[PDB]
Chain A
């Protein structure tokens, strides 16, 4: 009971669905990238700060 417009609308909806997943997945990836960024940085900054600290 659907016209070309109605089936096309539902296709457009499905595509919007895909775009929504695309965004959520990308955000999840960038968030973990940010976590690894901060973890490694804190480790490094404290390690070398302390090494030069102990020398002095």
Chain B
């Protein structure tokens, strides 16, 4: 039983536009039906939903306008709920207008407020202007004065006045000291001159000075009036704020409801209008599960509409290439997305995602087999999960944070397996895991074997521990014996093992992917795809690549150190296998008769090729002409496919050497970063050593995060994902599908 996509039907439903209105409401909130466009040649003007959409767009813009002003004012409006009710009466148009009135009112008030504000400032100047203190900006009054004398120097007294504690500049918007020079002139030419000057200069010298009491009384009058107008302004602004808060709540909720309204009308445009009755027929692609739920939903919808129209949905026997619908949940959604990132699978294709959930973390764990960082990696994921409720119910404009959050459950699992593999490798920041099981060698017996005081010469030598001295042997209980973690030749013992491991795992993973192709070939009833496809392809791979894997295990179990000199090399035998090179002597064979097996397997691998290479189009021609197909073109397709499979298996095997390459590369970073950073921080001097470790470690931990936890973890993520997409999926996960886009109530916020 494999997971496959859900069915999407070709059914059509037909019913009255009123029942359709209600049903669309119901189906959109249900979210389980994907509609088809019944009139591809018809524009929105042609659908005749343009009046409804336009209305929606206009009220939408108006609401947004008001909302923007509301947001500018920093109002608390929680926008807490009621949104789920989603009614859509035609009376919404009237609701819209009432909200339109608010916009107009608010704009009018602000316009008036600004106007009143301006008047206030001018009257404020008058307050100061009434002896009399005129108003200037006085940025460069030295020059104003000079220009005044240039036009006539020294003719009239310049009276100075100053403003104590000036308030916010009507223009500048700040509080500066102000002082003014006011000159009374008898001549008209000078009045005109200085008018032009003052216009050029940063100054307000507009009213005429008056000494008469009457003007002082006038100024007092207007100074009172403006105070009253300011009080009115203050009142209208407080009212506006009260209005804005109430509207903020009503509008945020209505706003969402409106967005849903628009969504409904949009969907309603995507239909065909009947001629016989004012009814629409619409087509949806839905699986039976959903179709039963929908029928019930339809009864609910039509019941909300006053007409309770039966609304018949007719199943379509004919099947139309559907979108691919994959049900996901909070955990598996992320894995499906990284699959979809490569492409949308063929309808009824085997979904790779259920296998990715484990396969991908495993490939990472091999690439990132680091026990210590595996823990840190999980802790990072846990942090995100612990804030899951706080991150979801908040704004997240940072897309990189959102992405890693969405992948938080992927990361956690990746860490989980990375710990597993790091534990077996026994590397935790280049630290081994001592289980008291290290019995590789018995040092006491080393000295007995004619090594007396070797530690004296040892000052200039290392000396490699011999195999099979009669006193050494026995595996480490779990994983690699910790002793190799401090060896100078770990770089051959452990590097070789990981090399062989990567090859073995890569081949197995490919064979798994191929095995899945058999199930796909069964589902689509293509016997030919296995008779000349699966069978000769898997025979090719087994005979060459599975044989190699068997030999690797054989070597480990067949030969001991007793034959270490000129020990058989699996690389050379593998090469000689392919080339049919069978020297009589000079090279030890793994087992007697190996040459016969080597020749047998390669010949058989060739014998399967004709089937996969050309017999498929050959039999298709046979069957085609008997039943009665571009034979030449089909030969081209199959020949290319055969080359890709056969050559790709060889290339794909190399691809999985990334497991070794990245595991080694990481191991090199960990060993070097430790050795050249924290190790040097240690010293025989007590206090200096302790304090040094503090500062050095802090930097060390920083480098481990910057280099390994982030950058390398990201690299291993990408490389393991590469293997999934190219080498695994390409064995069975083929073709493309369409995006599954049902009606849904997405506009919740």
Q: Could you list which residues of chain A lie within 8 angstroms of chain B, going by C-beta atoms?
A: 1-2, 7, 10-11, 13-14, 17-18, 21
Provide the residues of chain B in CB contact with A10, threshold 8 Å. Answer: 310, 312
Instruction: Find out whether the CB atom of A1 lies under 8 angstroms from the CB atom of B292.
Output: yes
Instruction: Find out whether the CB atom of A14 lies under 8 angstroms from the CB atom of B295.
Output: no
Provide the residues of chain A in CB contact with B186, threshold 8 Å. Answer: none
**CB of B260 to closest CB in A, whole Å:** 28
**CB of A2 to closest CB in B, whole Å:** 7
B277 at the interface (CB under 8 A from A): yes
Pick the residue among B277, B292, B309, B314 that contacts A7 (CB under 8 A): B314
Q: How far, in whole Å, are A7 and B311 apart by their CA atoms in the complex? A: 10
**CB of A7 to closest CB in B, whole Å:** 6
Known: A7-B314, A10-B310. A2 touches B295 (CB 8 A): yes
Instruction: Find out whether the CB atom of A14 lies under 8 angstroms from the CB atom of B292.
Output: no
Across the interface, name the chain B residue whose C-beta is closest to A17: B309
Q: How far, in whole Å, are A18 and B310 apart by their CA atoms in the complex? A: 12
Instruction: Find out whether the CB atom of B277 lies under 8 angstroms from the CB atom of A18.
Output: yes
Q: How far, in whole Å, are A11 and B312 apart by their CA atoms in the complex? A: 7
**CB of B248 to closest CB in A, whole Å:** 46
Residues facing A in B277-330 (CB within 8 A) are 277, 292, 295, 309-310, 312, 314-315
When A and B form their complex, what is the total count of cross-chain residue pairs whose Cβ atoms lie within 8 Å?
18
A–B Cβ pairs within 8 angstroms, 18 of them: A1-B292, A1-B295, A2-B295, A7-B312, A7-B314, A7-B315, A10-B310, A10-B312, A11-B312, A13-B310, A14-B14, A14-B309, A14-B310, A14-B312, A17-B309, A18-B276, A18-B277, A21-B277
Across the interface, name the chain B residue whose C-beta is closest to A1: B292
Q: Could you list which residues of chain B lie within 8 angstroms of chain A, going by C-beta atoms?
A: 14, 276-277, 292, 295, 309-310, 312, 314-315
Provide the residues of chain B in CB contact with A21, threshold 8 Å. Answer: 277
**CB of B17 to closest CB in A, whole Å:** 14
Q: How far, in whole Å, are A21 and B309 apart by their CA atoms in the complex? A: 13
**CB of A15 to closest CB in B, whole Å:** 10
Which interface residue of B276, B295, B312 has the most chain A CB atoms within 10 A?
B312
Provide the residues of chain A in CB contact with B277, threshold 8 Å. Answer: 18, 21
Provide the residues of chain B in CB contact with A1, threshold 8 Å. Answer: 292, 295
Provide the residues of chain A in CB contact with B312, threshold 8 Å. Answer: 7, 10-11, 14
Across the interface, name the chain A residue whose C-beta is closest to B291: A1
Q: How far, in whole Å, are A11 and B277 apart by their CA atoms in the complex? A: 14
Q: How far, in whole Å, are A13 and B309 apart by their CA atoms in the complex? A: 9
> Secondary structure at chain A's binding surface: helix, strand, loop or mixed?
helix
Across the interface, name the chain B residue whose C-beta is closest to A8: B312
Q: How far, in whole Å, are A46 and B601 apart by their CA atoms in the complex? A: 117
Provide the residues of chain B in CB contact with A18, threshold 8 Å. Answer: 276-277
**CB of B459 to closest CB in A, whole Å:** 88
Q: How far, in whole Å, are A7 and B314 apart by their CA atoms in the complex? A: 7
Told that A1-B295, A7-B314, A17-B309 touch, could you supply 14 new A-B pairs with CB distance under 8 A?
Answer: A1-B292, A2-B295, A7-B312, A7-B315, A10-B310, A11-B312, A13-B310, A14-B14, A14-B309, A14-B310, A14-B312, A18-B276, A18-B277, A21-B277
Across the interface, name the chain B residue whose C-beta is closest to A4: B315
Provide the residues of chain B in CB contact with A14, threshold 8 Å. Answer: 14, 309-310, 312
Across the interface, name the chain A residue whose C-beta is closest to B296: A1
Provide the residues of chain B in CB contact with A7, threshold 8 Å. Answer: 312, 314-315
Provide the residues of chain A in CB contact with B314, threshold 8 Å. Answer: 7
Across the interface, name the chain A residue whose C-beta is closest to B307: A17
Q: How far, in whole Å, are A7 and B14 apart by their CA atoms in the complex? A: 12
Provide the residues of chain B in CB contact with A2, threshold 8 Å. Answer: 295
Provide the residues of chain A in CB contact with B295, threshold 8 Å. Answer: 1-2
**CB of B336 to closest CB in A, whole Å:** 29
**CB of B729 to closest CB in A, whole Å:** 37
Provide the residues of chain B in CB contact with A17, threshold 8 Å. Answer: 309
Q: How far, in whole Å, are A21 and B16 apart by their CA atoms in the complex? A: 13
Which interface residue of B276, B277, B310, B315 has the most chain A CB atoms within 10 A?
B310
Q: How far, in whole Å, are A2 and B295 apart by their CA atoms in the complex? A: 9
Provide the residues of chain A in CB contact with B310, threshold 8 Å. Answer: 10, 13-14
Across the interface, name the chain A residue whose C-beta is closest to B16: A17
Q: How far, in whole Å, are A25 and B619 apart by their CA atoms in the complex? A: 67
Q: How far, in whole Å, are A7 and B312 apart by their CA atoms in the complex? A: 7
Interchain residue pairs A-B with the least CB separation, the first 6: A10-B310, A10-B312, A1-B292, A13-B310, A11-B312, A1-B295
Q: How far, in whole Å, are A10 and B312 apart by their CA atoms in the complex? A: 6
Q: How far, in whole Å, are A2 and B313 apart by their CA atoms in the complex? A: 10
Q: How far, in whole Å, are A18 and B279 apart by their CA atoms in the complex? A: 11
**CB of B303 to closest CB in A, whole Å:** 15
Provide the residues of chain B in CB contact with A13, threshold 8 Å. Answer: 310
Across the interface, name the chain A residue whose C-beta is closest to B295: A1
Q: How far, in whole Å, are A29 and B315 apart by their CA atoms in the complex? A: 38
Q: How far, in whole Å, are A48 and B276 apart by their CA atoms in the complex? A: 47
Q: How far, in whole Å, are A53 and B14 apart by their CA atoms in the complex? A: 64
Q: How far, in whole Å, are A10 and B13 apart by their CA atoms in the complex? A: 12
**CB of B76 to closest CB in A, whole Å:** 49
Q: How far, in whole Å, are A2 and B299 apart by their CA atoms in the complex? A: 13
Q: How far, in whole Å, are A17 and B309 apart by their CA atoms in the complex? A: 9
Q: How far, in whole Å, are A11 and B14 apart by their CA atoms in the complex? A: 10
